[PDB]
Design a protein around this ligand. Structure first.
Ligand code: HEM
Length: 467
């Protein structure tokens, strides 16, 4: 059947438009009151239908708020909602239980997370996205009132609030390392009806529980919901920059300046120039015109050369972040159902202040900043967990490579098996692809915690969650 976009929470398909976004992580302290309160929240919940209207209004221009809600397994238990058939071990077990296997640093095993993610019983998260702090703060006061926060009717307790902010000026839509984000998303069949060149279509059930392509009995209340993975990922920006500065690529002829060598290395760690121009299309120079053109900036698959050819890392290293997280032709030899199953929708936002002169000049992080990583999928095991653990953390992925090649770790998110995280990456020098680059002992991205949630449908919120 066609998708009913007025039944789907709007961060999942379309995504909540934003300059700032607050995540309000809560514990349910009064289940009966919470279910009554939730009836009054439902009219505030932004559906995909409303997002499409909102995006049409932004594209023609604005005070605009979007609201979604998601529940952890601990929250469903608290509400007495039987989730025996919801998701699989990952959602039921919670992210803290998965931290060791994700490769998160520990003093184990307990991960080195922020206390709120490590110590505390998170039952859910309310997402509030808006054009401004004023818009989000106003909407949060309304949502707090609905749940009685600050008064004797309270049904929830705040565990943690985290604010994200899109970066300023010409860095708008770039993450803190300086790279354009939000380019490549799967095209959901029945929603993204005009995929860009290179944008692979996926059956809706890769994203939405209970739809075509959802390879898992389901409870009726899970249809048209999606699993929300949250990770707070701290970024060490001066430390990343220091690594590029110390490791410029020198191509035959020694024509590149050290600055150009360091810039090229950055592009080859991610798979794109900071502009968003993909290196599989423009391997040795940026192309700002290409970077801005959605008909062109995703039209590659790592097929010329293909993975199995000698010296096949000429244009993009195997271990470049995007080639680890979306292998394209490195696996597209396998079934359309198999490769579509690994796709995620990303809806994160940067957090924290811009790098200060002192941080920049001293080359040392003083302030907490990074990515509030959010992704949606119908199956956490097939999406987020597989990408992190089978691909990013696997130095010998992909098997389509030549046998003598050891790609190494995703240099952005890749984590090694023991606290001794010695990480290497091959292929960064296109004319000496066997040469290993030792990554620093100190990670560039430091996980600070997160949780696995479920964003229900509107009808599920009305007919199952609310009272
Ligand atoms: C601070 C942490 C991270 C940074 C700085 C980062 C940065 C980026 C950048 C710059 C892009 C390229 C833009 C694009 O193609 O849309 C990208 C794409 C992507 N990232 Fe990340 N990322 C981070 C964490 C993660 C994590 C934890 C995952 C999954 C486990 C992930 C999965 C992806 C995927 C699937 C893509 C799209 C690949 C494609 O379709 O070509 N990223 N990321």
């Amino acid at each position: 059947a066609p998708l009913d976009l007025n039944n789907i929470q709007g961060d999942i398909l379309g995504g909540l438009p934003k300059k700032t976004e607050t995540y309000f992580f809560f514990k349910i302290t009064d289940a009966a009151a919470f279910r009554k309160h939730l009836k009054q929240l439902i009219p505030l919940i932004t559906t995909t239908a409303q997002v499409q209207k909102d995006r049409k209004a932004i594209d023609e221009h604005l005070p605009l708020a979007g609201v979604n809600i998601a529940f952890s397994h601990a929250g469903l238990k608290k509400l007495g909602i039987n989730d025996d058939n919801l998701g699989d071990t990952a959602f039921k077990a919670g992210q803290l239980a998965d931290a060791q296997n994700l490769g998160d640093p520990g003093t184990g095993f307990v991960p080195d997370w922020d206390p709120a993610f490590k110590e505390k019983d998170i039952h859910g998260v309310i997402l509030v996205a808006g054009d401004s702090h004023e818009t989000v703060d106003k909407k949060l006061q309304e949502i707090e009132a609905i749940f009685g926060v600050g008064g004797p009717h309270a049904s929830i307790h705040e565990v943690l609030t985290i604010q994200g902010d899109v970066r300023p000026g010409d860095e708008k839509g770039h993450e803190h390392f300086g790279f354009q984000d939000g380019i490549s998303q799967p095209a959901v069949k029945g929603f993204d009806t005009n995929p860009n060149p290179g944008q692979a279509p996926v059956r809706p059930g890769v994203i939405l529980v209970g739809r075509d392509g959802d390879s898992v009995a389901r409870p009726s209340w899970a249809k048209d919901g999606s699993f929300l993975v949250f990770r707070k990922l701290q970024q060490l920006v001066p430390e990343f920059n220091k690594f590029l500065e110390e490791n410029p690529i020198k191509l035959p002829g020694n024509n590149l300046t050290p600055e150009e060598g360091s810039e090229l290395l950055g592009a080859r760690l991610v798979g794109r120039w900071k502009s968003g121009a993909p290196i599989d299309i423009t391997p040795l120079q940026d192309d700002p015109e290409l970077a801005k053109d959605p008909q062109r900036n995703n039209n590659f698959r790592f097929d010329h050369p293909f993975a199995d050819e000698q010296d096949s890392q000429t244009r993009c290293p195997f271990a470049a972040h995007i080639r680890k997280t979306n292998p394209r032709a490195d696996l597209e030899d396998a079934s359309p159902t198999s490769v579509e199953s690994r796709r995620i929708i990303r809806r994160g936002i940067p957090y924290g202040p811009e790098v200060t002169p002192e941080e920049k000049e001293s080359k040392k992080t003083k302030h907490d900043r990074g990515l509030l990583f959010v992704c949606y999928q119908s199956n956490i095991e097939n999406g987020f967990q597989f990408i992190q653990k089978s691909w990013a953390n696997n130095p010998n992925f992909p098997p389509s490579k030549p046998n003598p090649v050891t790609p190494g770790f995703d240099p952005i998110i890749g984590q090694a098996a023991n606290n001794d995280g010695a990480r290497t990456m091959s292929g960064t020098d296109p004319n000496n692809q066997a040469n290993e680059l030792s990554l620093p002992t100190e990670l560039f991205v430091v996980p600070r915690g997160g949780e696995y949630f479920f964003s229900p449908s509107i009808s599920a919120l009305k007919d199952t969650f609310a009272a």
